[PDB]
Amino acid sequence: PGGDFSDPVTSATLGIVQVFWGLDKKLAQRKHFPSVNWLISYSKYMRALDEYYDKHFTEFVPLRTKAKEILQEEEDLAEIVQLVGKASLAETDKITLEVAKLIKDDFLQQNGYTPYDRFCPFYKTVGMLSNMISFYDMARRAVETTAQSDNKITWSIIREHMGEILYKLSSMKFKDPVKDGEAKIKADYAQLLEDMQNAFRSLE
Amino acid sequence: PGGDFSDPVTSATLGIVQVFWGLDKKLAQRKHFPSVNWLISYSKYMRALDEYYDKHFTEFVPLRTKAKEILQEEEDLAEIVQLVGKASLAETDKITLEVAKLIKDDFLQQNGYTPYDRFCPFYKTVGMLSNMISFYDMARRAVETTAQSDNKITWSIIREHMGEILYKLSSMKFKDPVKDGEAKIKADYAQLLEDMQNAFRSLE
Amino acid sequence: PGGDFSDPVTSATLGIVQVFWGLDKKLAQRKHFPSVNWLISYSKYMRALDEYYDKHFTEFVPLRTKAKEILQEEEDLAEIVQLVGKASLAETDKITLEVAKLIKDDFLQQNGYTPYDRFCPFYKTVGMLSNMISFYDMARRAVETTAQSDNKITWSIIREHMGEILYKLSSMKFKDPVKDGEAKIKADYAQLLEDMQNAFRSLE
Amino acid sequence: KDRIEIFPSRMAQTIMKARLKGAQTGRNLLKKKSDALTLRFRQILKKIIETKMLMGEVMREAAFSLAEAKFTAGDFSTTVIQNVNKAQVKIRAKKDNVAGVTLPVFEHYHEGTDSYELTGLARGGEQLAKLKRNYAKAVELLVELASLQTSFVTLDEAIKITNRRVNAIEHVIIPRIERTLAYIITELDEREREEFYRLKKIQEKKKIIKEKSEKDLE
Amino acid sequence: RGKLIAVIGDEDTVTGFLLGGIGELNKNRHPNFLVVEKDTTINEIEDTFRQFLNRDDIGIILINQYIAEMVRHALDAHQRSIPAVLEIPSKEHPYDAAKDSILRRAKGMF
Amino acid sequence: VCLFLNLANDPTIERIITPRLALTTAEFLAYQCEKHVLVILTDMSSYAEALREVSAAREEVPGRRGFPGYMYTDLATIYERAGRVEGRNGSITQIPILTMPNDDITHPIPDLTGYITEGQIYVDRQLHNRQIYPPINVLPSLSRLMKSAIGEGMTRKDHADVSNQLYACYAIGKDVQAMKAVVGEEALTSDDLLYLEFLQKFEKNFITQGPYENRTVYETLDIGWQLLRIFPKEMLKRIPQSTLSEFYPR
């Protein structure tokens, strides 16, 4: 009646269904599509599906876990910024917010009416997430490698040197699954991985 | 029951009636009578009455409008004042706050058990309101004109230099409709108008 | 429910019963057994018991009154202690806090598993509280009587001249009616009273 | 005024509990901010007292060194006061983010060139060199004392603001949420009684219709 | 850019800090200090103090403790956090903490 | 193990009978056959929803939140078929599992259950989203009878003290994580950094277990001590110095 998941139809459904895609008024209002809240939704089938993923997509389970972790640490960091602003945030917390913005705005977000986003195949999906989280790991390493060192590689030094790679990362969503087949998409994303590694190597 | 306007008799009544004089227990506790809450209350007949007011008091619709603006700005400022205290306000905001308190204490309150407030003829009503809104406009103009320069007028400077005017404005209720004739009340109120104009000209 | 006393069974019970012994988790977590809160607890029967007390324990009514006052001053002073530190309080406040600590830790606490706190007879209860409040009245007299003079008394001066009296006051809980006859406990308390009076005679 | 005016529903109970956790979290975060700033403010006050004691000593020594300079140099003061050009010592402002707040401070910077380099060549120049160094030490301690003052006043402001936010949460926002929640729980128990009463009447009507249907077969 | 210190005090206090390297003329030829003679009026010290605390170049003002007490009204009225005011002792004058405007603002101090 | 399955689409009255079979079998195994028995009642919420239907079947008027008035006695008739009995080695333990409606303990299903049962364990969405499996939040959780369960000759003698000190260090670690969020790392003390290192390692070694790694109480205590050893010996304020001298060294 008001989007409330305590309503008896939802409560009875939730005791039965193995998957629940909790769409959220705040996301729908800000026109975030497809409006799924990534901290309320769940899928009890992960246990079973991990057999298929470990046969066909061995990188995906690590990425899936790191994604939800990054997105939950986004809620922690986003709540405290209302009071403290940026002043307490570690350089790793900045890298967490930057990648959480990429994952929220350029991976989770998807336009249901525009041909570039009407449907997204799994090879595109895993490749997008692989790149965004490989950036998180390499950026987090670039910061933490300089802990107590004579000079710190800051989030801003990263963000400035990686600016082309950040634009490429956000651009991954634009590949057309019809004209750009999975082979071409995987090849382009493999070039993004190499470019990403080499851009980080300039600071290590 | 319990002073809650969600009660079904109230709810059904307000679906029909065209005037709502909602009486607030919190004003009645403070012995502010009539306890009509001016934010909650409404009259739907105002459009139908403006055609009458223009035949006798062309100034009245301007004054009624400005009265609601003063009270609305004060109620909105009060949501800040309740959390920060009386300290951070601009001089215009302090004028708005203090004139809204003048309007609350000396126009909206009426002591119906006394010779001066037993009844209030409509001429005394427009007169009192005209003087208080004239004070508001002049006090506002004085600050807004001088805040652009070193010789800035303040709300405290207005209060201190015009303390007798604030007392005179507050005194206006005590005029006795049986003993003070309509002409005498209008003349006394015209003296207040000129006293204000002379004092603001001395601040300029 | 969850420590909410507004549930009708609890609210009615505390409305009916003439006494409430407000056990509190914050006291039991520090092992302060019996863990009764001396602010939240109450007893309406005092006016009826005063007949018995006036006959058998005539000194007790003054003592229980002063005990509640000392405990109430501790709770009210504690805000100032947090706000500006204990060192910034007046001497009359400092001795008040020390006696409140002495009452809290060596009178109100009672370890019923031990041989000495196993049971506390009413005579022992009066004698303990009588000595603690006698020390408070003498300490209060010494600090207040010397206020604004050249020569001045403070808690450190008292403790330096009579630290054995504070130790003897704390020892009173260990005195056991099974080992020591009631006359012997009464004589020991008469000795502590004479000892503290002679100790204060060195200062005043 | 006393309540948030949210209409009572099982949804509204959930939203008020979510807001109460929000407000209690914001209270505790702002209380941690207040505690951290209060700790720095007490430390900075301790440092002010210590630095004013050090300032007393360096200023006594420097002021005594003026008497020494007046011994061997005569009235050098009139020459020093009248001839002024450029400051050998200047301050630069800097920001400290300690305790999750911005505190302004000053740094002691020195330009090399002595604006009084030749003063005392005739007499007193040895004692004037000692005097110059003593006042330079006084200025170093005063730049630190200013940094403590700018920090202290900025913490006084920031603690007052933060404690106002905490007390506004504790005495306005949380009480509005708690009264609103107690109201919503109350009106939800009222709606539960209406449904109990309505359903008891329905069951009574069915009982009467069952009995009448049996009686009509006799 | 930097800022400069300024001084309001007797000849000896001013002379000491000038040899400490404190003194600069502004582009308008006005100095960053006032020497106070025993016959100086409250308006000279106070108008100078009111100028110094509002100038763009001055970041710190040093005031001799005796003068700071003679101007105590305007001094304790100075509530801005950045342009700092230091009450300082001098050779024939009260000690560094006498009625100090900052020490008096603390609740934690006895 | 004896396993009873009642499906979501199985009849609502068979769902009421399922707990009663389980407890009847557990009563037989323990009290007729001396077995120590652990009963795992996996969703007391769907049992309570089945009681709601059986009450509707008798045309009874609904009580509190739409559940029957006698819901406390029916939940008690399930939960109190448990405990040890005089002169028998058998004993029925129960670990019910209970899906809290709307994540709120105030609901009659968890609320009445808290009144009847001896403490509760909370699974927490916060730990779940952080991938801490099992997602068991040890802070709001309380096993009421753990003072009985732990002692010399029942576990290592240190165990109760270890749990108390772990509780304090995890609670303080959470409080320091709230401080870090306001002040940033450079404003923290060395001890605060130890409580943060403790919190990180404690979630990632003590609480995190995985679905098939089995830890006996001895290995859980050695893990506990491996986390407690992060602090200097004198910082372990809820452990006696005798216990520290026997177990703090690693």
Q: What is the DSSP string of A2-45?
A: -S-TTSHHHHHHHTT-SEE--B-HHHHHTT-SS-B-TTT-EETT
Residue ranges of the binding site of C: 33, 110, 112
Got the DSSP string for B83-105?
HH-TTS--HHHHHHHHHHHHHII
* DSSP secondary structure letter of residue C105: I
Q: How far apart are CA C169 and CA C128, in angstroms?
A: 8
Q: What is the CATH number of the domain that holds D38?
A: 1.10.287.3240
Resolution reading in Å: 3.8
Q: How far apart are CA E33 and CA E40, in angstroms?
A: 14
Residue with tokens 């200097």, as numbered in its chain: F232
Residue ranges of the binding site of C for ADP: 33, 110, 112
Q: Looking at chain E, which subunits does it touch, using at least 3 CB pairs closer than 8 Å as the criterion?
A: C, D
What phi, psi does B174 have (nearest 5°)? -70, -5
F152 CB-near residues (< 8 Å, 6+ apart): none
C-alpha distances in Å from residue D135, one per residue of D50, D129, E16, E19? 19, 10, 6, 7
Q: How many CB pairs under 8 A join D and F?
A: 40
Residue with tokens 């005539």, as numbered in its chain: C58
Angle at F63 between CA F62 and CA F65, to 5 degrees: 100
For residue A36, count CB atoms less than 10 angstroms from its CB and return exposed for 0-12, middle for 13-18, buried for 19 or more.
middle
Q: Looking at chain B, which subunits does it touch, using at least 3 CB pairs closer than 8 Å as the criterion?
A: D
C79: its two tokens: 């805000």
C-alpha torsion sign, points C122, C128, C131, C135: negative
Q: How far apart are CA B155 and CA B143, in angstroms?
A: 8
Q: How far apart are CA F153 and CA E89, in angstroms?
A: 74
For residue C44, count CB atoms less than 10 angstroms from its CB and return exposed for 0-12, middle for 13-18, buried for 19 or more.
exposed
Is residue A53 within 8 Å of residue A61, measured between CB atoms?
yes
CA-based nearest residue in chain D for residue B87 = D161
* DSSP secondary structure letter of residue D88: S
D near A: at least 3 beta-carbon pairs less than 8 Å apart: yes
Residue with tokens 């940094």, as numbered in its chain: D147
Q: How far apart are CA C77 and CA C98, in angstroms?
A: 12
Would an 8 Å CB–CB cutoff place E109 in contact with chain C?
yes
Q: So where are chain E's domains?
A: 1-110
Q: How far is A195 from chain D (nearest CA, A)?
A: 36
Of D2, D7, D172, the CB nearest to B83: D172
Helix C60-84 vs helix C91-103: crossing angle, to nearest 10: 120
Is residue F67 within 8 Å of residue F121, measured between CB atoms?
no
> Do E107 and C87 lie within an 8 Å CB cutoff?
no
Q: How far is C93 from chain E (nearest CA, A)?
A: 14
Got the DSSP string for D129-170?
HHHHHHHHHHHHHHHHHHHHHHHHHHHHHHHHHHHHHHHHII
Residue with tokens 């009624």, as numbered in its chain: B64
CATH number of E1-110: 3.40.50.10580
> Do F45 and A87 lie within an 8 Å CB cutoff?
no
Specify which residues F123 forms β-bridges with.
F136
Whether the link from the prior residue into A34 is cis, omega within 30° of 0, is yes
Got the DSSP string for F163-207?
HHHHHHHHHHHHHHHHHHHHH-GGGS-HHHHHHHHHHHHIIIIII
A3 CB-near residues (< 8 Å, 6+ apart): A24, A25
Of F61, F104, F187, the CB nearest to D36: F187
CA-based nearest residue in chain C for residue E108 = C84
**Residues of chain D positioned with their CB less than 8 A from the CB of E100:** 52
Of D59, D85, D89, the CB nearest to E89: D59
Chain centre distance of CA B45: 21
Technique used to solve these coordinates: cryo-EM
Q: How far is C91 from chain E (nearest CA, A)?
A: 12
Would an 8 Å CB–CB cutoff place A81 in contact with chain F?
no
Q: How far apart are CA D56 and CA D69, in angstroms?
A: 20
Maximum separation of any 2 CA atoms in chain D, in Å: 143
* DSSP-derived pairing of the beta strands B19-20 and E4-9: unpaired
Residue F188's region, left for phi above 0, alpha for psi from -120 to 50, else beta, is: beta
Three-class SS of residue E4?
A: strand
F234: its two tokens: 């004198």
F near A: at least 3 beta-carbon pairs less than 8 Å apart: yes
Q: Looking at chain D, which subunits does it touch, using at least 3 CB pairs closer than 8 Å as the criterion?
A: A, B, E, F
**Residues of chain C positioned with their CB less than 8 A from the CB of E108:** 84-85, 88
Got the DSSP string for F64-103?
GGGS-TTHHHHHHHHHTS-EE-TT-S-EEEE------GGG
Q: How many CB atoms lie within 10 A of CB F224?
A: 23
**Residues of chain A positioned with their CB less than 8 A from the CB of F45:** 15
Q: Has residue D5 been placed in a domain?
A: no
C84: its two tokens: 């500006």
F65: its two tokens: 């939140």
C-alpha distances in Å from residue D199, one per residue of C177, D207, F63? 66, 12, 11
Domain residue limits at D87: 10-213
Residue of D6, D10, D13 to mutate for A, most A C-beta atoms under 10 A:
D10
Q: How far is E17 from chain D (nearest CA, A)?
A: 6
**Residues of chain D positioned with their CB less than 8 A from the CB of B82:** 168, 172
How many domains is chain D partitioned into structurally? 1
CA-based nearest residue in chain F for residue D17 = F104
State which H helix or E strand residue D90 sits in: strand D89-96
> Do F182 and D206 lie within an 8 Å CB cutoff?
no
Q: How far is A175 from chain F (nearest CA, A)?
A: 30
> Do B26 and D1 lie within an 8 Å CB cutoff?
yes
Specify which residues E60 forms β-bridges with.
E5, E84
Q: How far is B170 from chain D (nearest CA, A)?
A: 27
Specify which residues D94 forms β-bridges with.
D105
**Half-sphere exposure in the Cβ direction for F22 (13 Å, CA):** 27
Q: Has residue D43 been placed in a domain?
A: yes
Would an 8 Å CB–CB cutoff place A80 in contact with chain D?
yes
If we measure between CA atoms, which residue out of F23, F24, F65 comes closest to residue F45? Answer: F65
Would an 8 Å CB–CB cutoff place D109 in contact with chain E?
yes
Residue of D58, D64, D71, D90 to mutate for E, most E C-beta atoms under 10 A:
D90
Residue with tokens 């929000």, as numbered in its chain: D22
Three-class SS of residue A84?
A: helix
> Do B84 and D164 lie within an 8 Å CB cutoff?
yes
Q: How many CB atoms lie within 10 A of CB C175?
A: 16
Q: How far is B53 from chain D (nearest CA, A)?
A: 34
Q: How many CB atoms lie within 10 A of CB D8?
A: 19
Residue ranges of the binding site of A for ADP: 33, 110, 112
Three-class SS of residue D8?
A: coil
CA-based nearest residue in chain D for residue E17 = D135
If we measure between CA atoms, which residue out of D127, D155, D124 comes closest to residue D48? Answer: D155
Three-class SS of residue C23?
A: strand
* DSSP-derived pairing of the beta strands F136-143 and A42-43: unpaired
CA-based nearest residue in chain E for residue D154 = E81
If we measure between CA atoms, which residue out of C106, C37, C38, C33 comes closest to residue C68? Answer: C38
Q: How far apart are CA F56 and CA F74, in angstroms?
A: 15
Q: What is chain C's alpha carbon radius of gyration, rounded to the nearest angstrom? A: 19
